[PDB]
Scaffold this active site. Structure first.
Site, PDB file in Angstrom:
ATOM      1  N   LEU A 165       0.842  -1.187   0.000  1.00 61.06           N
ATOM      2  CA  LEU A 165       0.000   0.000   0.000  1.00 61.06           C
ATOM      3  C   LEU A 165       0.881   1.242   0.000  1.00 61.06           C
ATOM      4  CD1 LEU A 165      -2.233  -2.109   0.844  1.00 61.06           C
ATOM      5  CD2 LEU A 165      -3.104  -0.374   2.367  1.00 61.06           C
ATOM      6  N   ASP A 166       0.420   2.297  -0.673  1.00 64.82           N
ATOM      7  CA  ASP A 166       1.163   3.545  -0.689  1.00 64.82           C
ATOM      8  C   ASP A 166       0.519   4.529   0.287  1.00 64.82           C
ATOM      9  OD1 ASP A 166      -0.961   4.791  -2.531  1.00 64.82           O
ATOM     10  OD2 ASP A 166      -0.089   3.281  -3.863  1.00 64.82           O
ATOM     11  N   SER A 167       0.960   5.788   0.234  1.00 59.31           N
ATOM     12  CA  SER A 167       0.565   6.764   1.246  1.00 59.31           C
ATOM     13  C   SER A 167      -0.931   7.063   1.206  1.00 59.31           C
ATOM     14  CB  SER A 167       1.375   8.047   1.067  1.00 59.31           C
ATOM     15  N   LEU A 168      -1.540   7.025   0.019  1.00 57.26           N
ATOM     16  CA  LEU A 168      -2.946   7.410  -0.085  1.00 57.26           C
ATOM     17  C   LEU A 168      -3.878   6.357   0.506  1.00 57.26           C
ATOM     18  CD1 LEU A 168      -3.019   9.194  -3.555  1.00 57.26           C
ATOM     19  CD2 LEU A 168      -2.742  10.123  -1.256  1.00 57.26           C
ATOM     20  N   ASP A 169      -3.568   5.070   0.329  1.00 56.34           N
ATOM     21  CA  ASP A 169      -4.348   4.041   1.011  1.00 56.34           C
ATOM     22  C   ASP A 169      -4.195   4.150   2.521  1.00 56.34           C
ATOM     23  OD1 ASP A 169      -2.835   3.345  -1.444  1.00 56.34           O
ATOM     24  OD2 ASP A 169      -4.377   1.805  -1.650  1.00 56.34           O
TER      25      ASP A 169
END
Ligand SMILES: CCCCCCCCCCCC(=O)SCCNC(=O)CCNC(=O)[C@H](O)C(C)(C)COP(=O)(O)O
Lengths: 88, 115, 208, 379, 112
Positions: A42-46
């Site tokens: 997962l990246d920062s937005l998730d």
């Protein structure tokens, strides 16, 4: 004030349930000690979306300064308990 | 070298924090936009469109450009919240009338001279 | 100089030159150039950091009292490192005079907002931001004022095309106004009007 | 404290009201933004002249005159005397047209609606004057950067005299309907009061200054053409409200009649454009008989005249206030930049502060007293 | 005494000589803190001393209005307050210092 007090077992159950309802993390892979970036991909937005799900599940606001360090469900539970003042 | 005057952010981290704040605000607003404009899309695809519009600019490595983008996105959000836009402005993000364009070499060969 | 030539005024020329030297002497931290044109117009070229001081001086000094902001606008010159030049036109009623202040910026350098000096600047700055993409710092509410909602780009830039990128029509399938890439049934006809054989020797540039 | 969106000349108004009072009023503009300033960069100076007709389309020849003065200053030439007298005469006729429109539209929006017809008959007569001099009723394109396009027809001055000698009675009927009426006074007195210092700092001009007592008029302090050769008075207000501005506009109509009388009596003979064929086109007979005349006609109507490089800010006392142009020339036959300064821009920007602590029905009066046309505001 | 200066929002001042003297002395006091070599200090001191002597050599108000070349002593007082505010702000700004930096090589070259 006869309502039962909130417990870290209930805190963990609620956090894990909100994780389960998040459609990008399948239930079979997530654990309380799983890490959002590498263990789950997962990246920062998730992570930000998960934080807002926490915000509207636990009924309070989480500043961005301390919301960016919660990277596993365990420390999310720790932060909720710290802002909640529970014993067990 | 190459000293430049800041807009809002001294480095990349402050710009990323402003980006995250703007994204949180848009994500909160999407269901209200869907209900209030009586749109025919779901909240899920509205938030997907927000995510896509954020990811379109994910290659920028300059804090001045990043916070200028954030200023523009905040302007767009203010336009949406105050219902200064109409349903047509909101729906323009989806291009539901534009015909699909093939990215294949053969199809572009067949249709015309445009690379 | 027979009746077809515009007459010239030397007294006003001298007065404006003197006031230009006066202003330059008073504010040497910001003034880079002073000019008086042949039709008696005085312009002052300043550093961007001096927008608020210089203007304040010209509004409040007893020997200037330029209390009116006639116009604030921008000019786009793509060949310069600092693309945009910002032009302030000021009117003094006490001394019945006009002055012009110029500064510069690029696409990424903010300019201080002058709404605290002149209330009239507010909308003007909005217009500049709408048409050229110049950001003004500490503006009370900066947003688009002339273009359509959600319009992309800044149309008064030189590289912006005349007809833009999108056009609007009504669609009956979706029952609303939609935007599509622009297609013209007749393309605008570009004319090459400039002649060789330069017209004005007085403005010839060195052959470098 | 609710919000109202009074949308669709055409204006959108977003206001917050608490009860009946107006707490905040933000105008939204751009519904008539046509991109005039970008379009002008693709035209020669002559080709760009007709856009100024459409900028403030209640006062056409005044915008024409402002643009022509700017180009003349950049060209370092001067119009002949008869052209200047014709320009000032038609500028005062245009001021009469604009003031009739402003006052009667104000009254109609308030609810009077009879003087609108009474004075639009006179407006039709002045449209006839426009058409007889140029062939068009409003978008005239008559005043050029070298003078005027054509001389007056042989009987025009007589008819202008005949019209102007009966107009004072029409103004008197207007005043009988409006000036001393208690309903009009209650709708206009102490409404939209602005102080002199605020008016100066907010960029107001024209009546919006003179209503507050500021003694300023561009035809008196910075005269252009032959204005310094005519005498007239400048009406000055005392309370800075809508009623004083209405009185000022009526008085300027009377002073325009005075100036028109003077212009009629001192019209001089001679040519009507500058005798410089590299700027003003030759006569048709000369074009059809002389080689130089044919060449200069061809080049002026295909390439246009080149303007020496430089920038000017030229302003005039248009009927709505200071109308200005910042014109930048790069040495070619097409302007490099043309920024149009319209007084209605600053007036509408000040509408928010002018309507503080007033009723909803007073915003209409303030809009009418600001004399707003959105062609010049949006451009 | 007169009433209704004629400008909306500009009240009539009783005893304007004392107000003018106080304002001019405040302006001189503020200018005293500016460096002597600064052009702003010397120019404004010249102007202020001229006006102060003018108001100290004339008891009449209309003749003072004619002699001060400002007219309507109320707006003269307004201009004096504006000058005081500018003097304080300009002490804060210190614009007598040398130029911040030169423009790029062809920043002001016109045409092109
Ligand atoms: C209903 C219709 C809605 C319309 C939507 C409107 C959209 C508004 C416009 C968007 C505003 C911008 O471009 S904001 C500018 C975007 N920001 C950047 O490009 C900075 C560098 N890139 C990164 O930091 C990462 O790629 C990133 C994935 C971005 C962060 O994820 P992480 O830090 O975890 O890694």
């Amino acid at each position: 004030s006869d309502a039962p007090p909130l417990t870290l077992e209930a805190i963990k159950d609620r956090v894990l349930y909100v994780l389960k309802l998040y459609d990008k993390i399948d239930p079979e892979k997530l654990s309380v000690n799983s890490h959002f970036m590498k263990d789950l991909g997962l990246d920062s937005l998730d992570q930000v979306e998960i934080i807002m799900a926490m915000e509207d599940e636990f009924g309070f606001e989480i500043p961005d300064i301390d919301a960016e360090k919660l990277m596993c469900p365990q420390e999310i539970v720790d932060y909720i308990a710290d802002k909640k003042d529970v014993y067990e | 070298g190459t000293s430049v005057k800041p807009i809002f952010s001294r480095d990349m981290n402050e710009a990323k924090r402003r980006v995250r704040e703007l994204y949180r605000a848009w994500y909160r607003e999407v269901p209200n936009t869907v209900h209030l404009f009586q749109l025919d899309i779901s909240v899920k695809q509205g938030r997907d469109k927000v995510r896509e519009m954020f990811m379109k600019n994910a290659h920028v490595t300059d804090p001045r450009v990043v916070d200028l983008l954030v200023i523009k996105g905040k302007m767009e959000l203010e336009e949406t919240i105050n219902v200064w836009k109409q349903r047509t402005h909101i729906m323009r993000f989806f291009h539901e009338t534009e015909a699909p364009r093939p990215t294949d070499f053969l199809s572009k060969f067949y249709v015309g001279h445009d690379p | 100089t027979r009746p077809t030539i515009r007459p010239r005024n030397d007294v006003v020329h001298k007065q404006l030159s003197a006031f230009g030297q006066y202003v330059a002497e008073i504010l040497p931290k910001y003034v880079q150039q002073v000019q008086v044109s042949c039709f008696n117009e005085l312009e002052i070229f300043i550093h961007p950091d001096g927008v608020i001081p210089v203007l304040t001086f010209l509004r409040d000094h007893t020997n200037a009292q330029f209390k009116s902001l006639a116009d604030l606008t921008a000019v786009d010159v793509p060949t310069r490192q600092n693309r945009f030049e910002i032009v302030y036109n000021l009117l003094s009623l006490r001394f019945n005079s006009r002055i012009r202040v110029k500064t510069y910026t690029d696409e990424l350098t903010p300019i201080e907002s002058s709404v605290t000096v002149y209330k009239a600047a507010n909308w003007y700055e909005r217009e500049i931001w709408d048409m050229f993409g110049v950001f003004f710092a500490n503006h009370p509410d900066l947003r688009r004022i002339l273009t359509d909602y959600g319009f992309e780009g800044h149309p008064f830039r030189k590289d912006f095309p005349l007809s833009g990128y999108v056009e609007l029509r009504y669609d009956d399938e979706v029952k609303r106004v939609v935007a599509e890439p622009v297609e013209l049934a007749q393309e605008f006809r570009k004319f090459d009007l400039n002649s060789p054989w330069e017209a004005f020797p007085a403005y010839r540039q060195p052959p470098e | 404290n609710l919000t109202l969106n009074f949308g669709p000349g055409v204006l959108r108004l977003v206001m917050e009201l608490s009860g009946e009072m107006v707490r905040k009023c933000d105008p939204h503009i751009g519904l008539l933004h046509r991109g005039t300033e970008k379009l002008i960069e693709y035209k020669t100076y002559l080709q760009a002249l007709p856009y100024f007709d459409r900028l403030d389309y209640v006062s056409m020849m005044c915008n024409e005159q402002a643009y022509s003065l700017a180009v003349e200053k950049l060209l370092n030439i001067q119009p002949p005397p008869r052209a200047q007298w014709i320009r000032v005469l038609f500028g005062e006729i245009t001021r009469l047209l604009n003031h009739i429109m402003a006052v009667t539209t104000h009254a109609l929006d308030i609810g009077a609606m009879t003087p609108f017809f009474w004075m639009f008959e006179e407006r039709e007569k002045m449209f006839e004057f426009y058409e007889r001099v140029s062939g068009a009723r409003m978008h005239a394109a008559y005043i050029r950067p070298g003078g005027v396009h054509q001389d007056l027809p042989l009987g025009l001055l007589d008819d202008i005299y005949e019209f102007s000698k009966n107009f004072s009675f029409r103004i008197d009927e207007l005043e009988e309907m409006l000036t001393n009426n208690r309903i009009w006074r209650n709708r206009t007195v102490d409404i939209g009061v602005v102080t002199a210092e605020d008016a100066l700092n907010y960029g107001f001009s024209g009546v919006m200054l003179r209503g507050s007592g500021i003694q300023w008029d561009l035809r008196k302090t910075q005269p252009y053409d032959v204005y310094d050769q005519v005498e007239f008075d400048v009406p000055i207000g005392s309370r800075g409200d809508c009623y004083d501005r209405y009185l000022c506009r009526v008085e300027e109509m009377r002073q325009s009649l005075r100036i028109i009388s003077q212009c009629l009596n001192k019209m001089p003979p001679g040519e009507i454009k500058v005798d410089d064929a590299k700027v003003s086109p030759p006569k048709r007979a000369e074009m059809k008989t002389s080689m130089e005349s044919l060449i200069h006609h061809f080049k002026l109507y295909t390439e246009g005249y080149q303007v020496p490089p430089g920038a000017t800010y030229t302003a005039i006392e248009a009927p709505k206030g200071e109308f200005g142009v910042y014109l930048v020339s790069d040495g070619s036959s097409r302007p490099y930049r043309c920024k149009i300064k319209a007084p209605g821009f600053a007036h509408l920007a000040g509408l928010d502060k002018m309507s503080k602590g007033h009723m909803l029905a007073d915003v209409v009066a303030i809009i009418g007293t600001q004399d707003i046309v959105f062609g010049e505001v949006d451009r | 005494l007169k009433k209704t200066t004629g400008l909306v929002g500009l009240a009539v001042c009783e005893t304007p000589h004392e107000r003018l003297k106080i304002l001019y002395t405040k302006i001189l006091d503020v200018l005293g803190q500016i460096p002597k070599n600064a052009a702003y200090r010397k120019y404004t001191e010249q102007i202020t001393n001229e006006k102060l002597g003018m108001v100290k050599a004339e008891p009449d108000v209309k003749k003072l209005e004619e002699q001060l070349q400002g007219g309507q002593i109320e707006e003269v007082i307004l201009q004096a307050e504006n000058e005081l505010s500018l003097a304080r702000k300009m002490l804060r700004w210190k614009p007598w210092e040398p130029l911040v930096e030169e423009p790029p090589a062809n920043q002001w070259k016109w045409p092109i």
